[PDB]
Amino acid sequence: FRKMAFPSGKVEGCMVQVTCGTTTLNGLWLDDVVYCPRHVICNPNYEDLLIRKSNHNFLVQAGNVQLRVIGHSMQNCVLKLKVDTANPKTPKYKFVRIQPGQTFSVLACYNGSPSGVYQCAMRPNFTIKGSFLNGSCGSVGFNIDYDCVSFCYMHHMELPTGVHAGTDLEGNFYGPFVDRQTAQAAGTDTTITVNVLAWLYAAVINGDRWFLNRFTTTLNDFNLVAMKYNYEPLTQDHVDILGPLSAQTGIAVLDMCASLKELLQNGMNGRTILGSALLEDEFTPFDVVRQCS
Amino acid sequence: FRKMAFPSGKVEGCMVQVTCGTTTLNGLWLDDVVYCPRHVICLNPNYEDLLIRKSNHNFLVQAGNVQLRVIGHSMQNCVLKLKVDTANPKTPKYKFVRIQPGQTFSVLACYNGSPSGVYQCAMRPNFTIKGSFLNGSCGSVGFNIDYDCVSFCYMHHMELPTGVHAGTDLEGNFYGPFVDRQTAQAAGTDTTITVNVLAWLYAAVINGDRWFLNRFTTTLNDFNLVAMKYNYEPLTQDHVDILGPLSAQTGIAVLDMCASLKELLQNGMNGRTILGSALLEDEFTPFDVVRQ
Numbered sequence: 032f033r034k035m036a037f038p039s040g041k042v043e044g045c046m047v048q049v050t051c052g053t054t055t056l057n058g059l060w061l062d063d064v065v066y067c068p069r070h071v072i073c074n075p076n077y078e079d080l081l082i083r084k085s086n087h088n089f090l091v092q093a094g095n096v097q098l099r100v101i102g103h104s105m106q107n108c109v110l111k112l113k114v115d116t117a118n119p120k121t122p123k124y125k126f127v128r129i130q131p132g133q134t135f136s137v138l139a140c141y142n143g144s145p146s147g148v149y150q151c152a153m154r155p156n157f158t159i160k161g162s163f164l165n166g167s168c169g170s171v172g173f174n175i176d177y178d179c180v181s182f183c184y185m186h187h188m189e190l191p192t193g194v195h196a197g198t199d200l201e202g203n204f205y206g207p208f209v210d211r212q213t214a215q216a217a218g219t220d221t222t223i224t225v226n227v228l229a230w231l232y233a234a235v236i237n238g239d240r241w242f243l244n245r246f247t248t249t250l251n252d253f254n255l256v257a258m259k260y261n262y263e264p265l266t267q268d269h270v271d272i273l274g275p276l277s278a279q280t281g282i283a284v285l286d287m288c289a290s291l292k293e294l295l296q297n298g299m300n301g302r303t304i305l306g307s308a309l310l311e312d313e314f315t316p317f318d319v320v321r322q323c324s
Numbered sequence: 325f326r327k328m329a330f331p332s333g334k335v336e337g338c339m340v341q342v343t344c345g346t347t348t349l350n351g352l353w354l355d356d357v358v359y360c361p362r363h364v365i366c367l368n369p370n371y372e373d374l375l376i377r378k379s380n381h382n383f384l385v386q387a388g389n390v391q392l393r394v395i396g397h398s399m400q401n402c403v404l405k406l407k408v409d410t411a412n413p414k415t416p417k418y419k420f421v422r423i424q425p426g427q428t429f430s431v432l433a434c435y436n437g438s439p440s441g442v443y444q445c446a447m448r449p450n451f452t453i454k455g456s457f458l459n460g461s462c463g464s465v466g467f468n469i470d471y472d473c474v475s476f477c478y479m480h481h482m483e484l485p486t487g488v489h490a491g492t493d494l495e496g497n498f499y500g501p502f503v504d505r506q507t508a509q510a511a512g513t514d515t516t517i518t519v520n521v522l523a524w525l526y527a528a529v530i531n532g533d534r535w536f537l538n539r540f541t542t543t544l545n546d547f548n549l550v551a552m553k554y555n556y557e558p559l560t561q562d563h564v565d566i567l568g569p570l571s572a573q574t575g576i577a578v579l580d581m582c583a584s585l586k587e588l589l590q591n592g593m594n595g596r597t598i599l600g601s602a603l604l605e606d607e608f609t610p611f612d613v614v615r616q
């Protein structure tokens with residue numbers, strides 16, 4: 032199994048740079064709106080900072096071509112700059128707010144120019160482990176379903192521990208973070224249980240099934256046990272997204288939970304699963320199906 | 325640290341679907357030529373004979389919801405070249421390159437001429453690649469980007485019984501001793517790309533991971549004796565030179581990192597992990613580590 036990003040071309044066609052004074056970050060140009068982190072305008076009072084701004088103070092560029100700003104507004108932590116040109120490369124798109132544990136592709140950009148693409152999992156504490164250098168703010172995270180781009184992340188900051196935090200495309204942070212340059216702590220991270228379960232299903236699909244036990248369990252039982260091992264509690268949505276893999280294998284989700292509970296309490300007893308002594312938690316049920324099928 | 329592919333947009337604009345008979349795979353449309361694996365034309369295939377028997381009209385080439393008219397065809401090594409009557413307006417600046425083993429490249433995996441995923445691969449010393457390629461992936465390409473120029477280095481042809489993959493450059497020459505016939509083929513013994521493992525250990529130190537460092541040291545030759553024993557590639561002096569920037573940046577001499585790797589090979593990691601991995605990783609070049 033490989034971490035595999037979506038092809039980035041449809042998002043590349045939407046990347047621009049936004050500059051206030053000397054401060055440049057990336058923006059997302061969809062139809063006639065450019066979306067970018069509000070801290071391009073800088074414990075700040077963003078509303079009073081924004082009131083002082085006029086359209087003509089914002090430099091928006093696609094490459095070296097200026098896009099004239101004709102309106103500006105703030106939605107939570109994102110600035111929306113209305114521009115006078117509809118992006119001819121606008122894909123079919125939606126804005127979605129993902130759940131922790133879900134994965135997405137990031138197009139890392141600097142000065143509006145893409146540098147690389149890679150897959151991220153959002154940790155249960157709402158941080159991501161990116162590759163985000165200075166000037167990466169406004170880089171976006173996305174999934175692609177058919178020809179529809181689902182934008183789910185916009186990058187804003189790095190935490191003291193080196194992980195990253197940002198918002199959805201409506202400007203609402205993932206996690207208990209603010210776009211102030213203050214010291215901020217993420218919750219203690221946990222292992223993404225639903226993704227480990229997906230991984231075990233993937234092992235079964237490939238014929239590696241020694242760890243399957245003859246018992247089952249309750250979701251509450253598992254969640255109480257799993258908390259002792261630094262595993263995220265399962266939600267009903269988690270059970271639901273395992274449905275296709277459960278159907279593919281005939282193994283009930285709660286039967287797989289019992290198998291995982293046994294692995295956690297007893298360990299691997301010297302064995303490997305998919306050729307690894309470590310359980311993997313960065314592949315979602317969707318990722319497993321994409322790469323097997 | 326993180327495996328990072330090049331942005332794939334310039335390659336996406338070149339992918340088309342090619343069908344002959346009941347066989348469908350991907351092609352690369354640059355200017356007015358579509359490049360694809362010649363096994364689209366079909367256990368011992370005489371491709372020259374099968375090719376003489378094909379008509380231009382036998383080849384169904386689609387760029388999305390548009391058929392492209394094949395006005396000509398030829399074969400260079402294991403690559404079929406279909407001349408079409410329309411030039412691809414999205415053709416980027418490009419070159420065809422043959423990569424060296426241990427170098428890396430991005431793969432745009434495609435099915436039915438539609439891009440599905442992008443990821444980073446290395447050309448293994450035994451000239452296989454560890455890809456994620458399913459039925460219908462043939463003709464997917466590998467590439468690097470330098471400035472705005474796309475350097476195409478790989479086109480996908482086959483899977484080996486061990487689950488690794490083999491293909492050609494865009495001139496149609498296989499990497500490795502493989503043949504485009506439907507036989508189970510084994511690769512040579514693979515070996516580990518030492519200079520990349522060292523680059524990755526330096527990446528681990530930059531990210532604050534340093535439990536594996538030691539005060540021990542070693543000569544280049546004594547390192548290489550132990551490396552070869554564990555089926556690692558010998559480290560050349562040019563590879564030492566290539567590691568210079570990461571050495572400067574960390575203040576850890578290349579041969580000091582070699583001494584740490586020797587200890588890792590001899591003992592193991594004893595449950596410990598490096599950058600999250602129970603295994604020593606060898607598909608990051610020095611350049612890949614520096615650029616990031």
Ligand SMILES: *[C@H](O)[C@H](C[C@@H]1CCNC1=O)NC(=O)[C@H](CC(C)C)NC(=O)OC1CC2(CCN(C#N)CC2)C1
Pocket residue numbers: 349363457458459460461462463481482483484485486487489503504505506507508
């Ligand atoms: C072209 O799309 C296809 C891609 C292969 C098919 C599935 N994954 C791939 O990479 N290439 C071929 O079908 C190729 C044509 C000949 C070289 C003319 N033949 C091929 O790759 O055969 C493979 C199947 C194989 C046996 C089953 N194994 C297991 N488990 C792995 C490899 C030999």
